[PDB]
Structure formats: C-alpha cells, structure tokens
Design a binder for these strands. Structure first.
Ligand SMILES: [Mg+2]
Ligand SMILES: [Mg+2]
Ligand SMILES: [Mg+2]
Ligand SMILES: [Mg+2]
Ligand SMILES: [Mg+2]
Ligand SMILES: [Mg+2]
Ligand SMILES: [Mg+2]
Ligand SMILES: [Mg+2]
Ligand SMILES: [Mg+2]
Ligand SMILES: [Mg+2]
Ligand SMILES: [Mg+2]
Ligand SMILES: [Mg+2]
Ligand SMILES: [Mg+2]
Ligand SMILES: [Mg+2]
Ligand SMILES: [Mg+2]
Ligand SMILES: [Mg+2]
Ligand SMILES: [Mg+2]
Ligand SMILES: [Mg+2]
Ligand SMILES: [Mg+2]
Ligand SMILES: [Mg+2]
Ligand SMILES: [Mg+2]
Ligand SMILES: [Mg+2]
Ligand SMILES: [Mg+2]
Ligand SMILES: [Mg+2]
Ligand SMILES: [Mg+2]
Ligand SMILES: [Mg+2]
Ligand SMILES: [Mg+2]
Ligand SMILES: [Mg+2]
Ligand SMILES: [Mg+2]
Ligand SMILES: [Mg+2]
Ligand SMILES: [Mg+2]
Ligand SMILES: [Mg+2]
Ligand SMILES: [Mg+2]
Ligand SMILES: [Mg+2]
Ligand SMILES: [Mg+2]
Ligand SMILES: [Mg+2]
Ligand SMILES: [Mg+2]
Ligand SMILES: [Mg+2]
Ligand SMILES: [Mg+2]
Ligand SMILES: [Mg+2]
Ligand SMILES: [Mg+2]
Ligand SMILES: [Mg+2]
Ligand SMILES: [Mg+2]
Ligand SMILES: [Mg+2]
Ligand SMILES: [Mg+2]
Ligand SMILES: [Mg+2]
Ligand SMILES: [Mg+2]
Ligand SMILES: [Mg+2]
Ligand SMILES: [Mg+2]
Ligand SMILES: [Mg+2]
Ligand SMILES: [Mg+2]
Ligand SMILES: [Mg+2]
Ligand SMILES: [Mg+2]
Ligand SMILES: [Mg+2]
Ligand SMILES: [Mg+2]
Ligand SMILES: [Mg+2]
Ligand SMILES: [Mg+2]
Ligand SMILES: [Mg+2]
Ligand SMILES: [Mg+2]
Ligand SMILES: [Mg+2]
Ligand SMILES: [Mg+2]
Ligand SMILES: [Mg+2]
Ligand SMILES: [Mg+2]
Ligand SMILES: [Mg+2]
Ligand SMILES: [Mg+2]
Ligand SMILES: [Mg+2]
Ligand SMILES: [Mg+2]
Ligand SMILES: [Mg+2]
Ligand SMILES: [Mg+2]
Ligand SMILES: [Mg+2]
Ligand SMILES: [Mg+2]
Ligand SMILES: [Mg+2]
Ligand SMILES: [Mg+2]
Ligand SMILES: [Mg+2]
Ligand SMILES: [Mg+2]
Ligand SMILES: [Mg+2]
Ligand SMILES: [Mg+2]
Ligand SMILES: [Mg+2]
Ligand SMILES: [Mg+2]
Ligand SMILES: [Mg+2]
Lengths: 68, 275, 100, 114, 88
RNA sequence: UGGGAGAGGGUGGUGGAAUUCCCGGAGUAGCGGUGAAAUGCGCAGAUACCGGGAGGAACGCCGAUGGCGAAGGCAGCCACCUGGUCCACCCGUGACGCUGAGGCGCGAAAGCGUGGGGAGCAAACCGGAUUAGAUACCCGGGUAGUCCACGCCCUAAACGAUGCGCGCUAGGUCUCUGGGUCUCCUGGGGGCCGAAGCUAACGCGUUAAGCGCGCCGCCUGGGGAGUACGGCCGCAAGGC
C-alpha cells in the first residue's frame, strides 16, 4: 500500500498542495516513515520540509487525536 | 559603552563615566531652558524634609514635552540629541515643520535626521506617540501617560520601558518597568520604543566626590548615631540592631508594606511587582 | 533581485471592504519594498488544520515576486504589523521537484 | 441533569482517575482508585481502574447520564481495563479517542525519565 | 554573494591576455575579492568562527601564489599588490 | 565555467506540542509517590475536566548502521550574510608542492566577571524512606547553574585511545551524494566481510594497523606524580 504509488506526477516542493500532502501523514498527523511513503532519501527530505512549511501555514495539522 | 580609566589615582581605578556617544549637540536650546530652583531638600518651611541633599552642580532645566498629543499630525525632524542633567535619559531636539521646537526624552534608537510624529495614525515606529489603544499589543513603549491628557508619568528613566500585554474594554494592560501589571486607559499616550542611555546603570561613581557633584550629601547610618537621634543609636561599642530595624522615625523598614490599603487605583493594578 | 513567494493569511471575519483595504496596505508595501509582483493567487477562505487566532479559518493570499534580496526581511515585518495579518511567510522561490 | 457527555480517563502508572463531564466539558462526577477504596500501589492496578470507571459511570447515571464520549490520557496498566468497564456500565460510548499529551521535545524530564 | 558579473570584471581586469583565467594574477585578484568580502562579513559577524577558518585558508593560498609570483617576476608581483593594495 | 547535496557557521524573524504559574468555570475526597512506603500536597476545595492568560526552554513525527564540519560539535520553520566540499567540462596558470619547531585562531561540559533571564531540570542544602548504619542509590522539596549578550577559562575516555600528504597491493554486500551510453559504468563520502600482507594476540585489511617516501608530535619499568620547585598564563578555580 505504498503512498508514492497511489499518486501521479506531483511536486514535493509544493507546500500548498494540501490534498496530496495530507496523504503522507499518519492518521495521527505524523509525517510517515520511508517504509510507508516509499520515498528515497532525497525526496523524503523535501517531503518533510514542505509538510513542515504547510503546518506553519495552517494547511496541515501538527498533531491529531487518535480515534478507535 | 561606559568609559574606564586607568588607575592613575586611587579613585580613577574604579570610576567609570558614560560615553556620550549619542550626543550631537553640546548646548541647550535657549528658549527651552529655565532656571531650576535648587532646594537642598528643604520645603517651604525651611525644614529639611528630605535628608542629605545639597551642593551639586548648577543646572538649567530643559523643558520637556510629556504631552505630545498637543501636536497631532504635525511631524518633526530630530535635530539633535543632547545631555540633560535633570534626568538619566538623554533628550532629543525636535524641529516641527510648523517651526515649533520641543524636547522629548530620547528613545533608544532615535536617529538624528529622522522624523517622528504623534496621533492615532502614526506609524508604529520608534519615536512616535499614540494613544495606547492604537499600539499593537506586544510592542514596547515608554513615556506613558497614567491618565488621559495628564502627561507622561511611566517609564522615563534611562533604559526603561513598559510593554503592552493586552486589552480590556476602555483599558489596555501594561507591564511596568517594575513588573507591576497595570491597566492604563486606552486613551493615554505612549511613545514607541524604550528610553535610551541604557548603560546608565553600569556607571560607577568611583569616589565620594562624584556623589557630591550629584547633590548627594553623605548619608549616615542609624547605628552611628545616639538614641536621641535614631532607634539604632547608642549601645556601647558597635551594636546589632536590637530590635526590628527601623527608620529614624521608628517605622519598621525591612519588609513593612506601606501602600495605602483602600486606595482607588488598587482596582486597576492587576499584579504587584516582582522579585 | 531574486524570486520569492510571499504567503499571507488574513482575518477570516472581515467584510469585503476591510479585506480590500488590507490588500491595499499589502500592495503598497510590496511596491514600497521594491517588490515587483508577477503571478498572484487569492484562494480566499479555506479551512485550517488548526486554529489561528482562535479561529478555524483563514483568508489566503500568495504572490510570486521579484524583489531586492536585502528588503525581503524588512518587508515581512511590515507585512506582519497589521492586527488582521495573521501569518506571513516569505519563501525563496523554487523549481518543482517531481515524483512519478 | 444531562443526557450526553464525556468521560475522561487519566491512566498513569500509579492510578486511574475517571471524571465524567457535561457536553461543554464541566465535570458532573469523578472517581479513582482511591475513591473506590484502595491506597498505595493497588490503586494503579486494572482492578482498580475497573471499580473506578464503574463508580464513575454509576454516579453519572443517577444524574441522567446515558451516552458518553471517551477520552483517554495515559499509558497506565489501568487504561484498557478502564474502557472495558465504561462500555459494560450501561453507557453508550459513542467514541473512544486517545488524547494523551506528548511534547514535541519540550521541558527536560525528571531524572527517572532519562 | 559575489555576482558572476563582478567576477568577470575582475577576471578581465587582471588577465594577462584575452582568454586568461587562472594565471597567478587572476588567481590572487579573485582571492582578494573573496577575502575582502569575508573580512567585511566577519567585521559584523565576529562570532562566525567557522567562516573565519576559510578566511585563513584563502589568506594562506593568496600568500603562496604571491610568494611564487615574487620568485618568478618581482615587477609583476610589486605591481599586483600595488594594484590590489595588499602588503601591510 | 556550469551544476549538486548537507543539523557546516553568523544575524534577524517566527510556529505549534508539552510543563509551570495566574484568572474564570464546573466538581469532591482524595492526589501523588515507591519494591512497598513515608515526607509532601488536599474540605482554607487539591487531583482529574473545560476556557482564558503569562512565561522560559527544548523542537516530537520526518530520523537513519543518515548528513555536515579540522576538531569541539551542529536538528521546528523562514529570509539574509558566509565557510567548507563534491561532480561535470578538460578552458587558464606552469611544480606555484608536502609537512611544519615556534607563533596565531578555534576548542564539549563545568566553572568565572558584568548585565539580563528563569517554565522544566537540578550540584549544594532540607526532609521522607531503604538500611546494621545510609552524609548515597529511591521519594517529596530546592539554590547556583542550566538559557541570552559581552569578556574569561582552555580541560576531557577533546577516542577511531589510530598525525598529515602522496604512491602502490583481490574482491563481495549494504548506504549517502554526483555525473554517465542510466541493464551497468564512473567520482566523492559512510558501514560491514574479506585477497595478499601485517600483528603478541585480539584484530587491521583501497576509510590499513599492508608495502613504501617526506615532514611533525610522542614513548623508554611501576609507584612517588602530572606532584614539588622555577617560569609563563589566569579574576579565581586552575592551566601549561
Ligand atoms: Mg576606571
Ligand atoms: Mg584614562
Ligand atoms: Mg583605558
Ligand atoms: Mg595610585
Ligand atoms: Mg586605588
Ligand atoms: Mg549618549
Ligand atoms: Mg551609547
Ligand atoms: Mg553651556
Ligand atoms: Mg529667556
Ligand atoms: Mg528672552
Ligand atoms: Mg524648575
Ligand atoms: Mg518662599
Ligand atoms: Mg519664614
Ligand atoms: Mg519662623
Ligand atoms: Mg529623608
Ligand atoms: Mg537634605
Ligand atoms: Mg542625560
Ligand atoms: Mg549617564
Ligand atoms: Mg549600581
Ligand atoms: Mg549635578
Ligand atoms: Mg546614597
Ligand atoms: Mg554611612
Ligand atoms: Mg557607628
Ligand atoms: Mg557614637
Ligand atoms: Mg535633638
Ligand atoms: Mg526619646
Ligand atoms: Mg529611641
Ligand atoms: Mg541599639
Ligand atoms: Mg548594645
Ligand atoms: Mg554604638
Ligand atoms: Mg563598654
Ligand atoms: Mg561589644
Ligand atoms: Mg558607639
Ligand atoms: Mg545591641
Ligand atoms: Mg543586627
Ligand atoms: Mg535583640
Ligand atoms: Mg489611577
Ligand atoms: Mg499581526
Ligand atoms: Mg499509586
Ligand atoms: Mg581553498
Ligand atoms: Mg608575501
Ligand atoms: Mg480553579
Ligand atoms: Mg487550562
Ligand atoms: Mg553516521
Ligand atoms: Mg587545459
Ligand atoms: Mg598544515
Ligand atoms: Mg604549533
Ligand atoms: Mg570552552
Ligand atoms: Mg557552559
Ligand atoms: Mg556554568
Ligand atoms: Mg562558585
Ligand atoms: Mg554566569
Ligand atoms: Mg546572574
Ligand atoms: Mg537526608
Ligand atoms: Mg533515617
Ligand atoms: Mg537523602
Ligand atoms: Mg531529588
Ligand atoms: Mg523537583
Ligand atoms: Mg521554584
Ligand atoms: Mg554566582
Ligand atoms: Mg565516539
Ligand atoms: Mg577521523
Ligand atoms: Mg591522549
Ligand atoms: Mg595507553
Ligand atoms: Mg602533526
Ligand atoms: Mg607513524
Ligand atoms: Mg553512485
Ligand atoms: Mg543521476
Ligand atoms: Mg565527514
Ligand atoms: Mg566506497
Ligand atoms: Mg573487517
Ligand atoms: Mg590470509
Ligand atoms: Mg572495499
Ligand atoms: Mg601494531
Ligand atoms: Mg618512573
Ligand atoms: Mg624508579
Ligand atoms: Mg601543577
Ligand atoms: Mg589536571
Ligand atoms: Mg608553581
Ligand atoms: Mg595536555
């Protein structure tokens, strides 16, 4: 179920693309590991950097309560 | 910077003086000075009502503009920054475009050549005066009025400032230089910035004489006196206090609060001072 | 001159004239700081992931610009000053890094 | 008297406290290992959390409580058992959300935690 | 930073013949440009020790080149430092 | 000349999580803490829960057997200033190189001066336990300090216990970052396993502890002792 797969061409430096980005967060808000995103080193780093910008902007959350 | 001295006499060893680096004009504006009536600490009865004062350098009083809401919208150029013997802060010479000249206390950062202004629409920049209700919460501010139109009373000493912490109805809430938290009225003027000459506190007088120049006459311990004079007086040899340490007039002086209890402004002071 | 992408968030409970007004302060400043506007994209209201100024929503602006390197910082300050401006974030502009 | 509400479970290694609140969040009642009768470390146990959540839900029902939302903070040994008990109580449990507080590396912990 | 343009002017200003890059002269002159900027930068960021090391390295480098150039052709050296205001 | 990666450094801004305290609300008999407890806190209304506020400090996930730096070391995000370094092109200089006694700079923590700052933590210190005792370990408190600016100190298991540069001597697998004709090849880093060889052994092995040249530093039985004396440095502690 690797996330990089379930998407087309997309931008890792694109911090406003909330719809793409939010898929890389666990349901608890955490940036997901490489085992679940399927990114390389290089890409995964830009992923993290832009998710981080995004939360600053209001677009992505910093944390989410876990439901059952 | 404070200025040091080589120990070429015993006192120069620890004496430090201000650097006066900000000073650009070494003579007061003749129409803005007036004589200071030196008091000695004596009141109108002739009686000393404040001890140990007298004998300092002569001074001309520089008339300061602690209102400022007096000339809303009329900008002025900062002509010079000058020495003012009546306060720790330096003072700034204002040339209003009007042609009127006034002094203000010089905020840290004020540059000669620059422009300042007062009123509800003044830019939130250093040197400008506005009612408190128009100043962004969080900004640090000085020369604050305590009641509308009554003149700057808060944060005037070298290096001081208050910071606006938030608002509440007709009032804003300031943190005073003491750390006291107080509601001041929103309509009160305040000038953005802190007061300048912040190194003032690091000056070391260095010798008995320099206090003497400041008009501060020697201060004498109750212990060095006799019982007619002071609660601590007398006793054979040196003596410990032998009672709770007191003022010449007998009131206790380590800890006893003294602010009047039922005072109307209590309603407006949110938190007494720190530390 | 270098390219940056100014992001701005405004009070979501303004009327359209207040908002136009803020934009006027904003556009003056961009110009005053020698910013030359290029693209511009006003997606307006949009729900936030968390509250900013104790309020679930934000009014989003965005301006690809070209300005003097020195003035970018001072501008962000002048941008942030207004009690209605709730975030500014001025990012050095960059070439998209593509996946898939 | 209120129909729907909240149940918070504070589960630490030492105890379980359960307080039931109204919809706006204000407590109607609370209970804990101590309230149900234990002192010391026994308070920390799963049986402790059970009696606690029951007594908390029992007290809530007599104020009309019927459906609750369950909020869980802690990783104590009384945690999961505390939830069991709320379900089996006679209360609805529309949800179970974990809002355990964790810092994004904040204050330095006490020494026991390093 | 230094602008590519400013680099050229210097490269051009110093070059021994048209296409010249990396002769001793150009080498020394380009260094002097990075030197003086760092020197300046450090005047404000006195607490930037890491960059200061680099400064030292460059100063070192420029020095070797200058010693080489002085060995091979005094006139060219004397003129170079006179043109860049260097030995103190 | 064109490109790259990165917690490399400095300045300025700035975001959310948590803790603490204050304010409001609601609520009652305990909370907390341990191996178990007690001190402590709590009917003068604590704990737990909601909303508001203040403040300092550190930046969860990403995060790695990862990266960057000469080392110490460096981690939210943003911009500015700035160093190192690698690649590709094979364009320029024409041995301009290596090392380096002295010198100069940098140098974790603790410590020190002046002034800030102080939420959490916590030497000293108070008290509770444990115990034969318990100046400890564990529990409740707690001041320096931890944080900032500027100036000092100059140590270390400052470690790879491995000085720097160059050349030469099988490969296998993992990884980071470039350039390719992109299966695969070629650089520069970081790990493992190993040819030859080394080595007292343990182990090292193209990141040599192998085979060689250059330069530097250092060792010469254990203790006494990194002490004494002298000298130089330091505000002191103390350092050499
Ligand atoms: Mg002196
Ligand atoms: Mg002198
Ligand atoms: Mg001197
Ligand atoms: Mg003398
Ligand atoms: Mg003397
Ligand atoms: Mg001055
Ligand atoms: Mg000065
Ligand atoms: Mg005169
Ligand atoms: Mg006259
Ligand atoms: Mg006259
Ligand atoms: Mg007078
Ligand atoms: Mg009279
Ligand atoms: Mg008379
Ligand atoms: Mg008389
Ligand atoms: Mg008196
Ligand atoms: Mg007197
Ligand atoms: Mg003065
Ligand atoms: Mg002075
Ligand atoms: Mg003093
Ligand atoms: Mg005087
Ligand atoms: Mg005195
Ligand atoms: Mg005296
Ligand atoms: Mg006496
Ligand atoms: Mg006597
Ligand atoms: Mg008498
Ligand atoms: Mg008497
Ligand atoms: Mg008496
Ligand atoms: Mg006496
Ligand atoms: Mg006596
Ligand atoms: Mg006596
Ligand atoms: Mg006697
Ligand atoms: Mg005696
Ligand atoms: Mg006597
Ligand atoms: Mg006595
Ligand atoms: Mg006494
Ligand atoms: Mg007595
Ligand atoms: Mg009053
Ligand atoms: Mg704002
Ligand atoms: Mg317990
Ligand atoms: Mg170099
Ligand atoms: Mg030379
Ligand atoms: Mg309360
Ligand atoms: Mg709260
Ligand atoms: Mg590593
Ligand atoms: Mg060639
Ligand atoms: Mg060397
Ligand atoms: Mg040396
Ligand atoms: Mg150090
Ligand atoms: Mg330290
Ligand atoms: Mg210290
Ligand atoms: Mg001490
Ligand atoms: Mg200190
Ligand atoms: Mg201090
Ligand atoms: Mg004890
Ligand atoms: Mg005992
Ligand atoms: Mg003890
Ligand atoms: Mg303790
Ligand atoms: Mg503590
Ligand atoms: Mg405390
Ligand atoms: Mg001290
Ligand atoms: Mg190590
Ligand atoms: Mg090494
Ligand atoms: Mg050693
Ligand atoms: Mg050894
Ligand atoms: Mg060496
Ligand atoms: Mg050797
Ligand atoms: Mg490769
Ligand atoms: Mg490639
Ligand atoms: Mg490295
Ligand atoms: Mg390799
Ligand atoms: Mg091996
Ligand atoms: Mg073999
Ligand atoms: Mg190999
Ligand atoms: Mg050997
Ligand atoms: Mg010996
Ligand atoms: Mg011997
Ligand atoms: Mg010694
Ligand atoms: Mg020693
Ligand atoms: Mg000695
Ligand atoms: Mg040594």
């Amino acid at each position: 179920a690797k996330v990089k797969a379930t998407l087309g061409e997309f931008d890792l430096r694109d911090y406003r693309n909330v719809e793409v980005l939010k898929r890389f967060l666990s349901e608890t808000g955490k940036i997901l590991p490489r085992r679940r995103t399927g990114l390389s080193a290089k890409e995964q780093r830009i992923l993290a950097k832009t998710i981080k910008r995004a939360r600053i902007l209001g677009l992505l959350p910093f944390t989410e309560k876990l439901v059952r | 910077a404070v200025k040091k001295f080589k120990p070429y006499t015993p006192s120069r060893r620890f004496m430090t003086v201000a650097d006066f680096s900000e000073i650009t004009k070494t003579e007061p504006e003749k129409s803005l000075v007036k004589p200071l009536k030196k008091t000695g600490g004596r009141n109108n009865q002739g009686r000393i009502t404040v001890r140990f004062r007298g004998g300092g350098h002569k001074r001309l009083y520089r008339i300061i503009d602690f209102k400022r809401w007096d000339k809303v919208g009329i900008p002025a150029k900062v002509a010079a920054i000058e020495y003012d013997p009546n306060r720790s802060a330096r003072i700034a010479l204002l040339h209003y475009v009007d042609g009127e000249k006034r002094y203000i206390i010089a905020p840290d950062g004020l540059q000669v050549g620059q422009q300042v202004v007062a009123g509800p629409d003044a830019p939130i920049q250093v040197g400008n005066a506005l009612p408190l209700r128009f100043i962004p919460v969080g900004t640090v501010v000085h020369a604050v009025e305590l009641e509308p139109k009554k003149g700057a009373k808060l944060a005037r000493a070298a290096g001081t400032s208050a910071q606006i912490q938030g608002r509440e109805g007709d009032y804003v809430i300031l943190r005073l230089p003491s750390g006291e938290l107080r509601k001041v009225h929103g309509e009160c003027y305040a000038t953005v910035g802190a007061v300048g000459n912040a190194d003032h506190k690091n000056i070391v007088l260095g010798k008995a004489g320099r206090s003497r120049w400041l008009g501060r006459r020697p201060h004498v311990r109750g212990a060095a006196m006799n019982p007619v004079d002071h609660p601590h007086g007398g006793g054979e040899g040196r003596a410990p206090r032998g009672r709770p340490p007191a003022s010449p007039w007998g009131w206790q002086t380590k800890g006893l609060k003294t602010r009047k209890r039922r005072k109307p402004s209590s309603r407006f002071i949110i938190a007494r001072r720190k530390k | 001159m270098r390219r940056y992408e100014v992001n701005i968030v405004l009070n979501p409970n303004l009327d359209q004239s207040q908002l136009a007004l803020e934009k006027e302060i904003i556009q003056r400043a961009l110009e005053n700081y020698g910013a030359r506007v290029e693209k511009v994209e006003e997606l307006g209201l949009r729900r936030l992931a968390y509250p900013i100024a104790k309020d679930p929503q934000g009014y989003f602006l965005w301006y690809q610009v070209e300005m003097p390197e020195d003035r970018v910082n001072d501008l962000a300050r002048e941008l942030r000053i207004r009690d209605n401006v709730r975030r500014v974030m001025v990012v050095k502009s960059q070439e998209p890094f593509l996946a898939n | 008297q209120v129909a729907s509400g909240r149940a918070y479970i504070h589960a630490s290694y030492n105890n379980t406290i359960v307080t039931i609140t109204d919809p706006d969040g204000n407590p109607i009642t609370w209970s804990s290992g101590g309230v149900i009768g234990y002192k010391g470390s026994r308070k920390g146990t799963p049986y402790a959390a059970q009696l606690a959540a029951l007594d908390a839900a029992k007290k809530a029902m007599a104020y009309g409580m019927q459906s609750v939302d369950v909020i869980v903070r802690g990783t104590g040994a009384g945690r999961e058992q505390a939830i069991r008990a709320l379900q089996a109580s006679g209360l609805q449990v529309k949800s179970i959300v974990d809002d355990t507080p964790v810092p994004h590396n904040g204050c330095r912990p006490k020494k026991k935690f390093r | 930073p230094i602008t590519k343009e400013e680099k050229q002017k210097v490269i051009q200003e110093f070059a021994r013949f048209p296409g010249d890059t990396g002769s001793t002269e150009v080498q020394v002159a380009l260094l002097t440009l990075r030197i003086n900027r760092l020197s300046e930068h450090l005047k404000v960021h006195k607490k930037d020790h890491h960059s200061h090391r680099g400064l030292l390295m460059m100063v070192g480098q420029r020095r070797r080149l200058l010693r080489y150039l002085q060995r091979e052709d005094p006139e060219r050296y004397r003129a170079l430092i006179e043109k860049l205001g260097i030995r103190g």
